[PDB]
Amino acid sequence: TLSIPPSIQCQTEAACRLITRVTGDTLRAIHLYGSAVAGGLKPNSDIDLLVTICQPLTEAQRATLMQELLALSSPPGASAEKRALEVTVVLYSQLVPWCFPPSREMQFGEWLREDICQGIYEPAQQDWDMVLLITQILETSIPLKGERAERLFTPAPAAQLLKALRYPLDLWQSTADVQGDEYHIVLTLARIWYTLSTGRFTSKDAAADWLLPQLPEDYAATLRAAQREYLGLEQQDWHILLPAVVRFVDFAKAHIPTQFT
Ligand SMILES: Nc1ncnc2c1ncn2[C@@H]1O[C@H](COP(=O)(O)OP(=O)(O)OP(=O)(O)O)[C@@H](O)[C@H]1O
Ligand SMILES: [Cl-]
Ligand SMILES: [Mg+2]
Ligand SMILES: [Mg+2]
Numbered sequence: 001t002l003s004i005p006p007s008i009q010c011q012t013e014a015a016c017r018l019i020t021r022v023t024g025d026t027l028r029a030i031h032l033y034g035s036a037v038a039g040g041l042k043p044n045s046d047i048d049l050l051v052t053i054c055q056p057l058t059e060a061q062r063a064t065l066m067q068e069l070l071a072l073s074s075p076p077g078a079s080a081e082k083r084a085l086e087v088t089v090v091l092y093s094q095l096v097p098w099c100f101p102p103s104r105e106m107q108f109g110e111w112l113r114e115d116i117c118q119g120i121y122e123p124a125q126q127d128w129d130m131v132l133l134i135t136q137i138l139e140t141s142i143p144l145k146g147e148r149a150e151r152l153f154t155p156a157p158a159a160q161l162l163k164a165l166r167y168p169l170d171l172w173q174s175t176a177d178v179q180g181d182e183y184h185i186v187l188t189l190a191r192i193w194y195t196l197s198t199g200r201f202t203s204k205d206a207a208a209d210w211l212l213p214q215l216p217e218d219y220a221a222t223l224r225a226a227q228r229e230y231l232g233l234e235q236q237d238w239h240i241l242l243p244a245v246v247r248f249v250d251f252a253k254a255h256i257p258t259q260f261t
Contacts, residue, residue: 002037002140002141002142003142004032004036004037004142005036005041007080007081008036008041008047008083011047011072011081011082011083011085012032012036012047012049012144013144014072015047015049015069015072015085015087016030016144016145018065018068018069018072019049019051019065019087019145020145022061022064022065022068023051023053023057023061023065026053026054026055026057027051027052027053027054027145027146028052028053028054028092028146028152029051029052029143029145029146029147029152030049030050030051030052030143030144030145030146031049031050031052031137031141031142031143031144031146031149032047032048032049032141032142032144033048033049033050033133033136033137033140033141033142034046034047034048034086034136035048035203035204036048037140037141037142038136038140038201038203039203039206040203040204040205040206042230042231042232043077043080043232044076044077044084044232045076045083045084046076046083046084046085046086046109046110047083047084047085047086048086049085049086049087049088049144050088050089050090050133050134050137050141051087051088051089051090052090052091052092052095052146052152053089053090053091053092053105054091054092054093055091056091056105056124057089057105057106062106062121063119063121065087065089065106065108066106066108066116066121067116069085069087069108070108070113070116070117072085073085073108073110073113074110075110075113076110084109084110085108085109085110086107086108086109086110087106087107087108087109088104088106088107088108088130088133089104089105089106089107090102090103090104090105090130091103091105094130095130095134095153095154096152096153096154097154098154098156098160100131100156100160100163101126101127101128101130101131101164102126102127102130102131102134103124103125103126103127103130104124104125104127104130105124106121106122106123106124107122107127128163128164128167128168129164129168131156131160131161131163131164132161132164132165134149134153134156135155135156135161135201136201137149137153138150138153138155139201140201158260162196162259162260165192165195165196166192166196166256166258168188168192169189169192169252169253169256172185172249175242175243175246178242178245178246178249179239179242182226182238182241182242182245183225183226183227183229183230183236183238184230185245185249186222186223186226186245186248186249187204187207187208187223187226187227187230188204189248189249189252189256190204190207190208190210190211190223191204191207192252192256193207193211193252193255193256193257194206194207194210194211196256196257196259196260196261197257197261198261199260199261204227204230205227205230205231208223208224208226208227209227211223212224215251218244218247219247219248219251221244222241222244222245222247222248223248225241
Protein backbone atom coordinates (compact mmCIF):
# COMPACT_ATOMS: atom_id res chain seq x y z
CA THR A 1 0.00 0.00 0.00
CA LEU A 2 1.12 3.55 -0.83
CA SER A 3 2.78 5.57 1.94
CA ILE A 4 2.70 9.20 3.08
CA PRO A 5 6.26 10.62 3.29
CA PRO A 6 7.04 11.00 7.01
CA SER A 7 8.29 14.55 6.34
CA ILE A 8 4.81 15.81 5.31
CA GLN A 9 2.69 13.70 7.70
CA CYS A 10 2.20 16.37 10.38
CA GLN A 11 1.18 19.11 7.90
CA THR A 12 -0.99 16.66 5.89
CA GLU A 13 -2.83 15.57 9.03
CA ALA A 14 -3.30 19.25 9.95
CA ALA A 15 -4.80 20.00 6.54
CA CYS A 16 -7.11 16.97 6.74
CA ARG A 17 -8.33 18.06 10.20
CA LEU A 18 -8.99 21.60 9.05
CA ILE A 19 -10.83 20.47 5.92
CA THR A 20 -12.84 17.95 7.97
CA ARG A 21 -13.82 20.54 10.58
CA VAL A 22 -14.83 23.28 8.12
CA THR A 23 -16.76 21.07 5.67
CA GLY A 24 -18.34 18.87 8.34
CA ASP A 25 -21.51 17.15 7.15
CA THR A 26 -20.95 17.78 3.43
CA LEU A 27 -17.52 16.07 3.30
CA ARG A 28 -17.38 12.82 1.31
CA ALA A 29 -13.62 12.17 0.99
CA ILE A 30 -10.11 13.66 1.01
CA HIS A 31 -7.38 12.16 -1.18
CA LEU A 32 -3.67 12.85 -1.21
CA TYR A 33 -2.17 12.47 -4.69
CA GLY A 34 0.58 13.96 -6.88
CA SER A 35 4.28 13.69 -6.24
CA ALA A 36 4.02 13.10 -2.48
CA VAL A 37 2.48 9.72 -3.36
CA ALA A 38 3.49 9.09 -6.97
CA GLY A 39 7.13 10.11 -6.60
CA GLY A 40 9.36 13.10 -7.20
CA LEU A 41 8.79 15.16 -4.07
CA LYS A 42 11.23 18.07 -4.47
CA PRO A 43 11.99 20.96 -2.07
CA ASN A 44 9.61 23.26 -4.00
CA SER A 45 6.92 20.58 -4.42
CA ASP A 46 3.42 21.24 -3.11
CA ILE A 47 1.13 18.81 -1.23
CA ASP A 48 -1.75 17.91 -3.59
CA LEU A 49 -5.17 17.30 -2.03
CA LEU A 50 -8.58 16.63 -3.60
CA VAL A 51 -11.65 17.28 -1.44
CA THR A 52 -14.92 15.62 -2.56
CA ILE A 53 -18.11 17.10 -1.07
CA CYS A 54 -21.82 16.30 -1.49
CA GLN A 55 -23.35 19.80 -1.39
CA PRO A 56 -21.83 23.11 -2.51
CA LEU A 57 -19.95 25.14 0.08
CA THR A 58 -21.69 28.14 1.57
CA GLU A 59 -20.16 31.56 0.98
CA ALA A 60 -19.09 31.37 4.65
CA GLN A 61 -17.38 27.96 4.51
CA ARG A 62 -15.45 29.01 1.39
CA ALA A 63 -14.08 32.06 3.21
CA THR A 64 -13.25 30.04 6.35
CA LEU A 65 -11.52 27.31 4.35
CA MET A 66 -9.53 29.76 2.21
CA GLN A 67 -8.35 31.87 5.14
CA GLU A 68 -7.38 28.90 7.30
CA LEU A 69 -5.56 27.11 4.46
CA LEU A 70 -3.61 30.33 3.94
CA ALA A 71 -2.21 29.86 7.46
CA LEU A 72 -1.59 26.13 6.94
CA SER A 73 0.27 26.68 3.63
CA SER A 74 3.50 28.49 2.82
CA PRO A 75 4.89 29.68 -0.53
CA PRO A 76 6.83 26.87 -2.24
CA GLY A 77 10.44 26.64 -1.12
CA ALA A 78 9.87 28.97 1.84
CA SER A 79 10.17 26.23 4.46
CA ALA A 80 11.26 22.61 4.37
CA GLU A 81 8.76 21.84 7.17
CA LYS A 82 5.78 23.85 5.86
CA ARG A 83 4.99 23.19 2.20
CA ALA A 84 2.66 24.82 -0.27
CA LEU A 85 -0.76 23.19 -0.21
CA GLU A 86 -3.00 22.77 -3.23
CA VAL A 87 -6.58 21.98 -2.27
CA THR A 88 -9.10 21.31 -5.02
CA VAL A 89 -12.75 20.92 -4.04
CA VAL A 90 -15.24 19.14 -6.28
CA LEU A 91 -18.85 18.02 -6.00
CA TYR A 92 -19.36 14.25 -6.04
CA SER A 93 -22.20 14.92 -8.49
CA GLN A 94 -19.73 16.33 -11.05
CA LEU A 95 -17.88 12.98 -11.16
CA VAL A 96 -20.51 10.29 -10.49
CA PRO A 97 -21.82 10.34 -12.99
CA TRP A 98 -19.26 12.34 -14.99
CA CYS A 99 -20.02 15.87 -16.24
CA PHE A 100 -17.67 16.89 -19.11
CA PRO A 101 -15.89 18.99 -18.35
CA PRO A 102 -16.31 18.74 -14.59
CA SER A 103 -16.54 21.82 -12.44
CA ARG A 104 -14.42 22.44 -9.39
CA GLU A 105 -16.05 24.13 -6.40
CA MET A 106 -12.86 25.98 -5.44
CA GLN A 107 -9.10 25.73 -5.72
CA PHE A 108 -6.66 26.86 -3.08
CA GLY A 109 -3.08 27.40 -4.14
CA GLU A 110 -0.12 29.60 -3.33
CA TRP A 111 -0.17 31.18 -6.82
CA LEU A 112 -3.42 32.77 -5.55
CA ARG A 113 -2.10 33.92 -2.16
CA GLU A 114 -2.27 37.63 -3.02
CA ASP A 115 -5.92 37.37 -4.08
CA ILE A 116 -6.92 34.91 -1.36
CA CYS A 117 -5.37 37.15 1.32
CA GLN A 118 -7.74 39.92 0.16
CA GLY A 119 -10.88 37.76 0.19
CA ILE A 120 -10.83 37.32 -3.61
CA TYR A 121 -11.73 33.68 -4.32
CA GLU A 122 -11.96 31.98 -7.70
CA PRO A 123 -15.59 30.85 -8.10
CA ALA A 124 -16.72 27.40 -9.12
CA GLN A 125 -15.94 26.87 -12.79
CA GLN A 126 -15.33 24.26 -15.47
CA ASP A 127 -11.89 22.69 -15.46
CA TRP A 128 -10.76 20.05 -17.94
CA ASP A 129 -7.82 19.30 -15.65
CA MET A 130 -10.25 17.69 -13.17
CA VAL A 131 -10.44 14.77 -15.61
CA LEU A 132 -6.66 14.39 -15.32
CA LEU A 133 -6.77 14.78 -11.51
CA ILE A 134 -9.33 11.99 -10.99
CA THR A 135 -7.55 9.74 -13.50
CA GLN A 136 -4.28 10.21 -11.63
CA ILE A 137 -6.01 9.69 -8.27
CA LEU A 138 -7.69 6.49 -9.50
CA GLU A 139 -4.22 5.08 -10.12
CA THR A 140 -2.09 6.62 -7.35
CA SER A 141 -3.64 8.17 -4.23
CA ILE A 142 -4.16 7.79 -0.50
CA PRO A 143 -7.57 8.42 1.15
CA LEU A 144 -6.98 10.64 4.17
CA LYS A 145 -10.75 10.52 4.72
CA GLY A 146 -13.49 8.50 3.08
CA GLU A 147 -13.09 5.62 0.68
CA ARG A 148 -10.20 4.67 -1.57
CA ALA A 149 -10.42 6.24 -5.01
CA GLU A 150 -11.29 3.12 -7.04
CA ARG A 151 -14.34 2.63 -4.79
CA LEU A 152 -15.53 6.24 -5.14
CA PHE A 153 -14.89 7.42 -8.71
CA THR A 154 -15.17 5.74 -12.07
CA PRO A 155 -12.66 6.19 -14.91
CA ALA A 156 -13.50 8.70 -17.58
CA PRO A 157 -14.00 7.41 -21.13
CA ALA A 158 -10.77 7.45 -23.13
CA ALA A 159 -12.30 10.05 -25.48
CA GLN A 160 -12.69 12.57 -22.66
CA LEU A 161 -9.28 11.81 -21.19
CA LEU A 162 -7.87 12.51 -24.67
CA LYS A 163 -9.67 15.86 -24.83
CA ALA A 164 -8.47 16.78 -21.34
CA LEU A 165 -4.84 15.87 -22.12
CA ARG A 166 -4.76 17.92 -25.33
CA TYR A 167 -6.75 20.92 -24.05
CA PRO A 168 -3.74 22.82 -22.56
CA LEU A 169 -2.05 22.70 -25.98
CA ASP A 170 -4.37 25.57 -26.96
CA LEU A 171 -3.43 27.54 -23.83
CA TRP A 172 0.07 28.20 -25.21
CA GLN A 173 0.06 29.93 -28.59
CA SER A 174 1.82 33.27 -28.06
CA THR A 175 5.18 34.17 -26.54
CA ALA A 176 3.45 35.86 -23.59
CA ASP A 177 1.37 32.69 -23.04
CA VAL A 178 4.53 30.87 -21.93
CA GLN A 179 6.76 33.71 -20.62
CA GLY A 180 7.28 33.47 -16.86
CA ASP A 181 6.26 29.79 -16.74
CA GLU A 182 8.79 28.39 -19.17
CA TYR A 183 10.20 25.27 -17.59
CA HIS A 184 6.82 24.27 -16.13
CA ILE A 185 5.22 24.28 -19.59
CA VAL A 186 8.10 22.34 -21.17
CA LEU A 187 7.84 19.61 -18.52
CA THR A 188 4.04 19.46 -18.65
CA LEU A 189 4.20 18.95 -22.41
CA ALA A 190 6.66 16.12 -21.76
CA ARG A 191 4.14 14.52 -19.39
CA ILE A 192 1.25 14.99 -21.82
CA TRP A 193 3.32 13.40 -24.57
CA TYR A 194 4.25 10.51 -22.28
CA THR A 195 0.64 9.86 -21.23
CA LEU A 196 -0.66 9.91 -24.82
CA SER A 197 2.06 7.50 -25.95
CA THR A 198 1.87 5.05 -23.05
CA GLY A 199 -1.50 5.57 -21.44
CA ARG A 200 0.35 6.10 -18.15
CA PHE A 201 1.27 8.91 -15.75
CA THR A 202 4.81 9.60 -14.57
CA SER A 203 6.82 12.24 -12.76
CA LYS A 204 7.98 15.44 -14.40
CA ASP A 205 11.59 14.25 -14.23
CA ALA A 206 10.91 10.75 -15.63
CA ALA A 207 8.73 12.24 -18.38
CA ALA A 208 11.66 14.43 -19.44
CA ASP A 209 14.01 11.42 -19.44
CA TRP A 210 11.55 9.41 -21.56
CA LEU A 211 11.11 12.16 -24.17
CA LEU A 212 14.74 13.29 -24.51
CA PRO A 213 16.00 10.44 -26.81
CA GLN A 214 13.10 10.97 -29.21
CA LEU A 215 13.79 14.66 -29.88
CA PRO A 216 16.09 16.38 -32.35
CA GLU A 217 19.03 17.66 -30.34
CA ASP A 218 17.85 21.29 -30.44
CA TYR A 219 14.58 20.37 -28.70
CA ALA A 220 16.28 17.96 -26.28
CA ALA A 221 18.53 20.86 -25.23
CA THR A 222 15.51 22.95 -24.26
CA LEU A 223 13.90 20.02 -22.41
CA ARG A 224 17.19 19.36 -20.64
CA ALA A 225 17.42 22.98 -19.49
CA ALA A 226 13.87 22.81 -18.17
CA GLN A 227 14.51 19.50 -16.38
CA ARG A 228 17.79 20.78 -14.96
CA GLU A 229 16.15 23.88 -13.50
CA TYR A 230 13.27 21.90 -12.03
CA LEU A 231 15.72 19.51 -10.38
CA GLY A 232 17.44 22.55 -8.83
CA LEU A 233 20.71 21.86 -10.65
CA GLU A 234 20.80 25.14 -12.60
CA GLN A 235 18.77 28.33 -12.97
CA GLN A 236 18.67 29.43 -16.61
CA ASP A 237 17.95 32.88 -17.99
CA TRP A 238 14.54 32.00 -19.37
CA HIS A 239 14.15 35.35 -21.12
CA ILE A 240 17.11 34.35 -23.32
CA LEU A 241 15.57 30.87 -23.73
CA LEU A 242 12.01 32.06 -24.51
CA PRO A 243 12.32 31.87 -28.35
CA ALA A 244 13.52 28.27 -28.00
CA VAL A 245 10.67 27.50 -25.59
CA VAL A 246 8.19 28.80 -28.19
CA ARG A 247 9.79 26.49 -30.75
CA PHE A 248 9.57 23.59 -28.28
CA VAL A 249 5.87 24.28 -27.63
CA ASP A 250 5.24 24.40 -31.39
CA PHE A 251 7.21 21.18 -31.86
CA ALA A 252 5.11 19.42 -29.19
CA LYS A 253 1.89 20.68 -30.81
CA ALA A 254 3.06 19.32 -34.16
CA HIS A 255 4.28 15.94 -32.90
CA ILE A 256 2.29 14.86 -29.80
CA PRO A 257 -0.13 12.05 -30.76
CA THR A 258 -3.74 13.00 -31.50
CA GLN A 259 -5.06 9.69 -30.12
CA PHE A 260 -3.74 7.22 -27.58
CA THR A 261 -0.99 5.08 -29.11
N1 LIG B 1 0.01 14.02 -18.60
C1 LIG B 1 0.02 14.62 -17.41
N2 LIG B 1 0.49 13.93 -16.35
C2 LIG B 1 0.46 14.51 -15.14
N3 LIG B 1 0.02 15.72 -14.81
C3 LIG B 1 -0.44 16.39 -15.88
C4 LIG B 1 -0.46 15.93 -17.19
N4 LIG B 1 -1.00 16.88 -18.03
C5 LIG B 1 -1.30 17.88 -17.23
N5 LIG B 1 -1.02 17.64 -15.91
C6 LIG B 1 -1.43 18.48 -14.79
O1 LIG B 1 -0.32 19.17 -14.27
C7 LIG B 1 -0.52 19.41 -12.86
C8 LIG B 1 0.64 18.82 -12.10
O2 LIG B 1 0.47 19.12 -10.70
P1 LIG B 1 1.78 19.35 -9.81
O3 LIG B 1 2.56 20.55 -10.27
O4 LIG B 1 1.41 19.39 -8.36
O5 LIG B 1 2.65 18.07 -10.18
P2 LIG B 1 3.44 17.00 -9.30
O6 LIG B 1 3.55 15.70 -10.07
O7 LIG B 1 2.79 16.86 -7.99
O8 LIG B 1 4.89 17.64 -9.13
P3 LIG B 1 5.43 18.71 -8.07
O9 LIG B 1 6.32 17.85 -7.14
O10 LIG B 1 6.30 19.64 -8.90
O11 LIG B 1 4.26 19.36 -7.38
C9 LIG B 1 -1.89 18.80 -12.52
O12 LIG B 1 -2.92 19.78 -12.59
C10 LIG B 1 -2.03 17.72 -13.60
O13 LIG B 1 -3.37 17.33 -13.85
CL1 LIG C 1 10.19 11.12 -4.14
MG1 LIG D 1 2.43 18.47 -6.63
MG1 LIG E 1 -0.12 20.90 -7.46
